[PDB]
Design a protein around this ligand. Structure first.
Ligand SMILES: *[C@@H]1O[C@H](CO)[C@@H](O[C@@H]2O[C@H](CO)[C@@H](O[C@@H]3O[C@H](CO[C@H]4O[C@H](CO[C@H]5O[C@H](CO)[C@@H](O)[C@H](O)[C@@H]5O)[C@@H](O)[C@H](O)[C@@H]4O)[C@@H](O)[C@H](O[C@H]4O[C@H](CO)[C@@H](O)[C@H](O)[C@@H]4O[C@H]4O[C@H](CO)[C@@H](O)[C@H](O)[C@@H]4O)[C@@H]3O)[C@H](O)[C@H]2NC(C)=O)[C@H](O)[C@H]1NC(C)=O
Ligand SMILES: *[C@@H]1O[C@H](CO)[C@@H](O[C@@H]2O[C@H](CO)[C@@H](O)[C@H](O)[C@H]2NC(C)=O)[C@H](O)[C@H]1NC(C)=O
Ligand SMILES: *[C@@H]1O[C@H](CO)[C@@H](O)[C@H](O)[C@H]1NC(C)=O
Ligand SMILES: *[C@@H]1O[C@H](CO)[C@@H](O)[C@H](O)[C@H]1NC(C)=O
Ligand SMILES: *[C@@H]1O[C@H](CO)[C@@H](O)[C@H](O)[C@H]1NC(C)=O
Lengths: 112, 259, 52
């Protein structure tokens, strides 16, 4: 399959400070139609996962503007400009190019 | 395709020199007062036709080498290497010229001091500076070449004078030359400008018996991995792109371009 | 024993005159004076003149 590595495992941040999570893949994620198809999800404790970022840069409807993701080739990054109390949970990255569908390890965000 | 606009890169604003060039920024041209504040940048942006540089005519020694050194610089700290009031007790530090005007008046550079005779005498000069700032210091000075011997006698009271600048990597001796020259910017005299880069732990000695444009402010430089100089007429805006051209920013994961 | 001195090295491809300079210098290796070193490459059949 395709191995996805996230860094770091735990990222404690203080209220009002930026945070960054990095996702790396073993293979290139470009498709023959001209897109990349990498997604970033948020999971709150005791709740279903919901989607934040679809494709490299596009942001889902209802997602706050503080979530911004970018990257290319094999390295990708999700950045949060301001961290609030609703930003706790575990964040994941997937690829949607190659069979089978692979998820990331997961990064936990705690408030200091 | 491009934006057509200059903007930020990796979350850092560029240094836009405006109507000033690099020489007018480092020497302290009176129309370049906004750039004399201690800051940081990602790349340097310049107007292709800038007309505010060396207001007094003269030759800038190793100007392109100074540009090549300043290309890979992330930040500077402007500090007072020699205080104007206290480090010259027996000279006149007030010197103005009509070639460098500020607000319809006569003024001089903001980083250089023109020393002239006081009470009919020009004593011998010897000053030293030691570096303790743990980074490279850019030191700038100048040597004055007058037009006739009467101006030399009225300003410095000596027919023969010399300047010697000595460091652990710089050793030079300068002698004024009096000759008849064409008028550039209303002045027939010249001032030749020189620069050096002190290393941490090093010392510099200035010795003079005449014709010295002493340093006033110096720059403490810090190096960085990626920076450069871009000539543009494109305006500043807000972005966070990862590529910048003189035409505009580019947002592609594509391998090629033709801009 | 002279305040003013000169060195002149003249060849068929080298022609250069040197004058001593006296100034206050920082101490490097316990000495404040300097010695400036120069070199040249003579060709076969050529001559060099040192005058000082
Ligand atoms: C600002 O900077 C400038 C440049 O850096 C400084 O200028 C320097 O000033 C120095 C003096 O402070 C001066 O040094 C003097 O050099 C003289 C010339 O040396 C030659 O001559 C002597 C003696 O030869 C004699 O005979 C020949 C042939 O007839 C004559 O031509 C000579 O004039 C002599 O009559 C030789 O021994 C040398 O080898 C040279 O050939 C010296 O004469 C002079 O010596 C006198 O001063 C000494 C210090 O006071 C003193 O110990 C000595 O005994 C001499 O005393 C004279 O003066 C006193 C006081 O007036 C008087 O009572 C005595 O009777 C006698 O006349 C110096 O050695 C540098 O040459 C000069 N450098 C230059 C011009 O670049 C300037 O000082 C500095 N200003 C400040 C703020 O300090
Ligand atoms: C900065 O540059 C401007 C021009 O870009 C200079 O203004 C000119 O000054 C000269 C005097 O040497 C005049 O002859 C011109 O008519 C002026 N042109 C304009 C458009 O004003 C200005 O002097 C420069 N400033 C300094 C300090 O050198
Ligand atoms: C940058 O990307 C956006 C979104 O894909 C696009 O609308 C815009 O035209 C791009 N910029 C350029 C100069 O093509
Ligand atoms: C210039 O830099 C010095 C650091 O040596 C600092 O103390 C000073 O505040 C700076 N001046 C500014 C930013 O105007
Ligand atoms: C300046 O003049 C005073 C008064 O004579 C003197 O004491 C001093 O040594 C001179 N030089 C300096 C560097 O102050």
């Amino acid at each position: 399959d395709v191995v996805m590595t996230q860094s770091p495992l735990s990222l404690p941040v203080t209220l009002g400070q930026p945070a960054s999570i990095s996702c790396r893949s073993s293979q290139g994620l470009a498709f023959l139609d001209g897109n990349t198809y990498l997604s970033w999800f948020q999971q709150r404790p005791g709740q279903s996962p919901r989607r934040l970022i679809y494709k490299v840069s596009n942001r889902d409807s209802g997602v706050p503007d503080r979530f911004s993701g970018s990257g290319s080739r094999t390295d990708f990054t999700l950045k949060i400009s301001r961290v609030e109390a609703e930003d706790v949970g575990v964040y994941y990255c997937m690829q949607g190019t190659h069979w089978p569908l692979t998820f990331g390890g997961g990064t936990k965000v705690e408030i200091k | 395709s491009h934006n057509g606009k200059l903007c930020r890169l990796k979350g850092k604003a560029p240094l836009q020199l405006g109507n000033c060039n690099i020489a007018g920024w480092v020497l302290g041209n009176p129309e370049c007062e906004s750039l004399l504040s201690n800051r940081s940048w990602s790349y340097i942006a310049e107007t292709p036709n800038s007309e505010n540089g060396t207001c007094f005519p003269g030759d800038f020694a190793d100007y392109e080498e100074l540009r090549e050194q300043l290309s890979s610089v992330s930040s500077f700290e402007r500090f007072e290497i020699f205080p104007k009031e206290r480090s010259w007790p027996n000279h006149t530090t007030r010197g103005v010229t009509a070639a460098c005007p500020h607000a319809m008046k006569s003024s001089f550079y903001k980083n250089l001091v023109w020393l002239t005779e006081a009470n009919g005498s020009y004593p011998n000069l010897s000053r030293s500076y030691v570096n303790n700032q743990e980074k490279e210091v850019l030191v700038l000075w100048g040597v004055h070449h007058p037009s006739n011997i009467e101006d030399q006698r009225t300003l410095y009271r000596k027919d023969n004078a010399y300047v010697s600048v000595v460091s652990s990597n710089y050793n030079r001796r300068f002698t004024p030359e009096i000759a008849k020259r064409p008028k550039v910017r209303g002045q027939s005299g010249r001032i030749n400008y020189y620069w050096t880069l002190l290393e941490p732990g090093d010392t510099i000695i200035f010795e003079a018996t005449g014709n010295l444009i002493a340093p006033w402010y110096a720059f403490a430089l810090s190096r960085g991995p990626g920076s450069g100089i871009i000539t543009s007429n494109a305006p500043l805006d807000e972005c966070d792109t990862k590529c910048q051209t003189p035409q505009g920013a580019i947002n592609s994961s594509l391998p090629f371009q033709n801009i």
